[PDB]
Amino acid sequence: ENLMQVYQQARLSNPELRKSAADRDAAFEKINEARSPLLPQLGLGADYTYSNGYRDANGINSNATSASLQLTQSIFDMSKWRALTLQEKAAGIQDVTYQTDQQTLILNTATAYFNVLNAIDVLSYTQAQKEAIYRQLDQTTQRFNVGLVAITDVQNARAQYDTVLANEVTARNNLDNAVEQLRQITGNYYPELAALNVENFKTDKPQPVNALLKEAEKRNLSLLQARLSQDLAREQIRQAQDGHLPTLDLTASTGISDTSYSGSKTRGAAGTQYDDSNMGQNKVGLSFSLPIYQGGMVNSQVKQAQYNFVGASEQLESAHRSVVQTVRSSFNNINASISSINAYKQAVVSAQSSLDAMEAGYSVGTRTIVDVLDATTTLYNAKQELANARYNYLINQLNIKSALGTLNEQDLLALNNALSKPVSTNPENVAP
Amino acid sequence: ENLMQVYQQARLSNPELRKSAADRDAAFEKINEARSPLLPQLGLGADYTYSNGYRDANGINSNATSASLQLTQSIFDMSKWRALTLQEKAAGIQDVTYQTDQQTLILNTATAYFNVLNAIDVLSYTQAQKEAIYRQLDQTTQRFNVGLVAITDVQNARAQYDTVLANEVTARNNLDNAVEQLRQITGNYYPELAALNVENFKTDKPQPVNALLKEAEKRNLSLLQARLSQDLAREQIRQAQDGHLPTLDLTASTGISDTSYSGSKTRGAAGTQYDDSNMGQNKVGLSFSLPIYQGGMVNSQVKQAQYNFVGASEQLESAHRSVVQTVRSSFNNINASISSINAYKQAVVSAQSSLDAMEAGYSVGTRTIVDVLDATTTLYNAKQELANARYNYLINQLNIKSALGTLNEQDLLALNNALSKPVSTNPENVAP
Amino acid sequence: ENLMQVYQQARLSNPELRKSAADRDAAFEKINEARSPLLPQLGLGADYTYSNGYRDANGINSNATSASLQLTQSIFDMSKWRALTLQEKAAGIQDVTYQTDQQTLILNTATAYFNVLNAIDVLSYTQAQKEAIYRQLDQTTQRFNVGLVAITDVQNARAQYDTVLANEVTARNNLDNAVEQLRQITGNYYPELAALNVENFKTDKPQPVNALLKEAEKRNLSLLQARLSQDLAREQIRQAQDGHLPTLDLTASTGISDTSYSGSKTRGAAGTQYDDSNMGQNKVGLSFSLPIYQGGMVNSQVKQAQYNFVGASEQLESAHRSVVQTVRSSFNNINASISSINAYKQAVVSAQSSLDAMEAGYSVGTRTIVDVLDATTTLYNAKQELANARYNYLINQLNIKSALGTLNEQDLLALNNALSKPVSTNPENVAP
Amino acid sequence: CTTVTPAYKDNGTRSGPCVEGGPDNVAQQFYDYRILHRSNDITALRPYLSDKLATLLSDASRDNNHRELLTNDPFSSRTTLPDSAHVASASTIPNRDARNIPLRVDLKQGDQGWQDEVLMIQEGQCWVIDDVRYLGGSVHATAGTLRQSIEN
Amino acid sequence: CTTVTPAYKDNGTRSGPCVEGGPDNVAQQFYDYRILHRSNDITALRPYLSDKLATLLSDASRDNNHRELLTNDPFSSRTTLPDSAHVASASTIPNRDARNIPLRVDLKQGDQGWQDEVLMIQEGQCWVIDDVRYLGGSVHATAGTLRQSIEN
Amino acid sequence: CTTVTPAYKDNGTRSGPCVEGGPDNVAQQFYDYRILHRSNDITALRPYLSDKLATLLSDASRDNNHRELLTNDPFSSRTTLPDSAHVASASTIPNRDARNIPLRVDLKQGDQGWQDEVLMIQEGQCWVIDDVRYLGGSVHATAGTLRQSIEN
């Protein structure tokens, strides 16, 4: 399983990107939610009431049942439109956040894959060290048996062997934890992963840092999010200033009312004012309002909105400075990694030469088995360091691409050309 | 003062768990406020108003006073019941958080105790190293005084002595900081704590990781909190869809009104229609309302609730994956600790053998005093490392128990069987 | 530029403190918004409504146009005063937070300056090490050329040279990062900074820890913020209990109405009951409301406020304990820094003596150039360590003042008496 | 009115047959099929497992290692079969960006209940049983979920 | 109506006699005793101190080192007894899950004030005084609070 | 009514003359001068650069390295001048605790637009245009912003 299939699986079964998608969908639906009040509002209502008179209105009882259908619609109210614009801007910032989570998901899965590979290499090196140390301990034991050293040498050799065993257990558990983390990030257990192809891996100098800044100025996600936040702050200032404006609405109502009267006074000489009445009304009206001085209220809120705008501007400037920081540091990291790669390659060459010399000496007869075993251990350590440096270089390239705000699956496509030979991840198959 | 007494005192005076208890009690008490709207609501109101006519009704004035007692009570409104159930679920999740706080308090106090013990051991080792380095410096000074070595060796020895003095000061300050941290976590200064016993201490293999996962899946606190959050999300969905439902309420009132008319036109040919009125009205009725199309509104709220439920489900899945990974990591860490314990035991055995050989050589006459002093320093270092490994093993057992979610004072009681010998923690006492 | 000038420039343009200042200003201005409801209110409203009768009221149509100017003002309502007090306390805590931000900005800029100086020293030492290692490689290559060592020694020397080259590249990148971090925290790139003076710098004993605690318990900003938060919680209790009090207000109005009636029923013998009305009313009156039993309502809110107050008290106690622990840790850190300074001074003396010995031996003719080069490398390493320790001690002397809660620019001025000589910070200028 | 655009675009690669739809609906249909019969075979349960559970349980049957577990009831905590099932209510699922939906199905035996849990996965255009976490005391055998019980 | 179950179940182990209760009430009673009785002795103040402030004061008196601090006043920042006292007001305490309650006591001398700070703890079923943090300018002696003053 | 107290005390250190006021107003006046005069000289824009852009541009012109950068245009992402400009709207600035105010300006050439970004700083008691971050496709030359472009 190369990086491509791993990332393809991690795109679907990843229970933290789905949260961002749900948040984006909720923000999008809030646009319709905020647009709902602008639409006409109608409702039906029933009301049954009984009243009993007393004191001057002694012996008077009334019963009124009413059914009213109401329909109201605003004609001029800028606040609803301003809220709709605010919701649109919130949806935009949520979309930017979702893009950020996509990028960090790509970075995380790449990091996990390379960590698993490094754990495999470390385990192999530790197994070689274990073989060498066990042979050294057996040498010391034989020397004591025929008699050439004190018992303290045997004790020291046994202590070294036990320390090596503990290190081997630690490395095995580290590999297991790396595999578990990969499973958690992908929701699947991977028994075999593609390793690195040394021949096809060619380090390349990056483009000038100036061009990186130029692209990151107009391409970075954090800067765009801060700009959208500042725009939202401006819209909030406009909404706060909107309070000085008048409002206008139109109401319509269809009402059916039935009123009946009873009591001692009703059975009198009222005649026309005390009767059962069946009213039907079709009311249409226009309501206009215009608030005037309310203490501070709107003025204080406008001042608060201006202060929030100043804060948003400061946030935007700080975000730009942080972006410049991240781009420059990421650019320097690649050059540091290239220098480290060259140094570790030279170290590997020197270790291989030393191992070859030790092998020749042992074959001729001037060396023992423990010497060539120690040389192999040193060579394996150097190889592990070089492989870790290569993986760090790949991760640093991905880091530059992400901090520039352009990370996608094309970078993974470019990286996948260097993964050729598969290798198992089970400790028993890697090292029984 | 063993671990049991320290923890018992910590459960009383710890200004972090009591805050959690206060939050839990407030969340539980909010249930009454949530249920309050379902209860009958009665109020009283007094009004006095003077009105002055104009234009057509020029010179007509009215003075009215009214005292009203109004009671209202809902009949069918499922929203309040939904809110009450939501409050109950919130109280449940708050209680779960309180349990988590209890567990982390237990873990923290155990960690602080073992840190204090480790600081004591490190200080003892550093004091031994200081003595050895001072004797080495005295030897070098004597050698230069009679004349056997250059001045560079003397300067280097003085530098080493100054370095070991600085290390001793650092270790003393570290011990003081550990004691102060224990005091902060318990609110009481402790001058003596129980140390570790080597005979009673034992290492047992844990249960298989499968049973650990089985217990954790049904007993972990975080998973229960996530499941309760999902239930709350579903209840929120239902209470949001509740908005389609109608509403019905009952109202009763008792009103006493006194009105008078005067000013000019009243004292005219009206005679009867302009007179003081003393009204008493016991109005009782019912009101039913059924809302109709309000734009998106309810539909948008329902969609947002569904998206929130999806997000809660994603949270639950992520929590389950994290719990599984944590259990696996703890189960591997305990094995790593066992291996480290064995390695350090063998190392201390070898160091003791080396010290015995050096002591025998000194007694015979083939060794000096600096050699046996260095051997003692190495043995002390090995002993300190072994003690730190033992404390790490105990902490790992507590950690896996916490990951299972079954952590309480019984585990501390089990741990307390290994602590027998008390030792003081005063920096001056251990290091004069 | 010395520390004083850097801080003076940073105080103006630093896009992190401006956000705090803007938020403080918004909190201060919110007092007017809180007080506005207590001030008198006035409003205007015009409404034109057409009513169409039906059923019993058939052939009856009405047109009513009304314009009302209403002025309302409360008299006795303690809720507004409670809200005003709450807002004032919020402004106070915000100002305290702003002061804390000022202190942390001072600490951050000082730390960045000392980091840049440390990076310069590290780069110089690394350059010296590179020169020494290159000379070692040349020696080995010459020995192999005439023929004295195997090829393995040449390969090992080349590996060491590549390693030191990578280290030099990493050190240069670290210096660049430190310089650009200073630019980010100050908004301007600094090409030259004042270095440290060996003779002017003197190590001073700190005041007794008891006096530190005495001043900190009354000057620390976190404690003041916690106490003010407790006061806010008490005021919240009072405003929640305020629900047991009645309300009183006065209203006045001026309403002008024009009502006309038409329709078949009106066009008859109504005579007096259907006439065009031009009405005007100057309505003035009072309104008093005394709520009674509402279910839980007030009692549950009061109980929740009590629980919140208990939590606030717990927070205050925790803050006090943390402050005490921090003060003790800072004092111990100062003492440890003094001891480390002495140790590193002795180490520098020893390294200088060794270098002089090597130089004298080379002059006599018993040493090679590479030996004195290695001695120079060791001396440079010792000097860099001593300078880093001095910077750490100065940073600790600032940290103790920050913990005590009295940091300001006078401490920076006092520190500035030691920064006398200047030095460029360009990587090429320091090491081409 | 406007709509909501999905964040994802494929969410597919389905091989076996699928039921009509509905997470709670497919869970209920699966439990009714289990109770109506008395076989609990994995060959005839292919529509309810997407591509992982079917092959994993086939391999578990083939290796002849979990025979005692496989015979009784892989899919339930109790070694016998439940008498009735009732999953938690779910009010549909908007759009296609929703996977790994945990549902706590409630199982009712003769005066006993365990209330296990299952997982919903989309894998194309249907809903698929997954995991089954054995949310009950005194589980049948092995431990944890079904996947953690059969995985080597 | 429903009730709230307390989270804790012991909150006890009290040794000395306890006064009726009430944090502000207990502080008022103690300071009224201080104003009315001009003795300040620790022998008659046992019911107010919690469980070990009295023991700490007795040990300090027996140590014969902090005589100057004990003689003038241990319980206030000022070396003289106050003229009036007004402690912070607490509107009772629900249940029993509340400890370490700090109160800012305002002690007024002749046109003077320092706003000292004290602590109160439960320690059983009562309300007892603790710490006294000397939150005021011109501290009497030593430094910090009383406890840090006599601690070792 | 109350009035807030400004957080800062001086916020000064201004050398050259300052325009009347208004950040958006200052930017609009700058762009109006840009369209009105087709020379893009830096000697006539002295009261529009605060304290460092003036000397930085003078150095960049004196060392004869960014001649091609300066001759075309230093204040936009295109070599040629725009046809019209419309800066972002800022509703005044309370007190004086406000610097580093970024604004996005929509500059419209012949059926074209780039929406560049600029900074406003106080630098005393005025408002000064600064930086210009070259936001838009098909940038003029070099890279980054103007300050990063002409820095050494």
Numbering used by the authors:
A (entry chain C2), B (entry chain C3), C (entry chain C1): 23 to 454
D (entry chain P3), E (entry chain P1), F (entry chain P2): 19 to 170
Kindly provide excerpts from the paper associated with this entry.
An improved 3.39 Å resolution structure of the endogenous AcrAB–TolC complex from *E. coli* was determined, revealing well-resolved density across the entire assembly ([Fig figs3], [Table tbls1]). YbjP remains bound to TolC, suggesting that this lipoprotein is stably retained during pump assembly and functions as a molecular clamp that anchors TolC to the outer membrane during AcrA and AcrB engagement ([Fig fig2]). TolC, tethered to YbjP, caps the outer-membrane end and docks onto a hexameric ring of AcrA adaptors in the periplasm, which in turn surrounds the AcrBZ trimer embedded in the inner membrane ([Fig fig2], 2D). Cryo-EM density reveals six AcrA molecules beneath each TolC trimer ([Fig fig2]), yielding a 3:6:3 stoichiometry for TolC:AcrA:AcrB. The trimeric TolC, which contains six HTH motifs due to internal repeats (TolC repeat 1/2), engages the AcrA hexamer via quasi-equivalent binding: adjacent AcrA and AcrA* protomers interact differentially with the intra- and inter-protomer grooves of TolC, respectively ([Fig fig2]). Strikingly, the membrane-proximal (MP) subdomains of AcrA exhibit asymmetric binding: AcrA-MP interacts with the DC and PC1 subdomains of AcrB, whereas AcrA*-MP contacts PN1 and DN via an extended loop, respectively ([Fig fig2]). AcrZ adopts a helical structure that is embedded within a hydrophobic groove formed by the transmembrane helices of AcrB at the predicted interaction site, forming an AcrB₃AcrZ₃ complex. Our high-resolution cryo-EM structure of the endogenous TolC-YbjP-AcrABZ complex captures the AcrB trimer in three distinct conformational states (L, T, O), providing key mechanistic insights ([Fig fig4]). While the transmembrane domain remains largely conserved between the L and T states ([Fig fig4], upper panel)— maintaining salt bridges between Lys940 (TM10) and Asp407/Asp408 (TM4), the T→O transition entails a coordinated rotation of TM2, TM4, TM5, and TM6, disrupting these interactions ([Fig fig4], lower panel). Substrate entry occurs between PC1 and PC2 in the L state ([Fig fig4], left panel), followed by an 8 Å shift of PC2 toward PC1 during the L→T transition ([Fig fig4], lower panel and [Fig figs6]), facilitating drug transfer from the access pocket to the high-affinity deep binding pocket ([Fig fig4], middle panel).
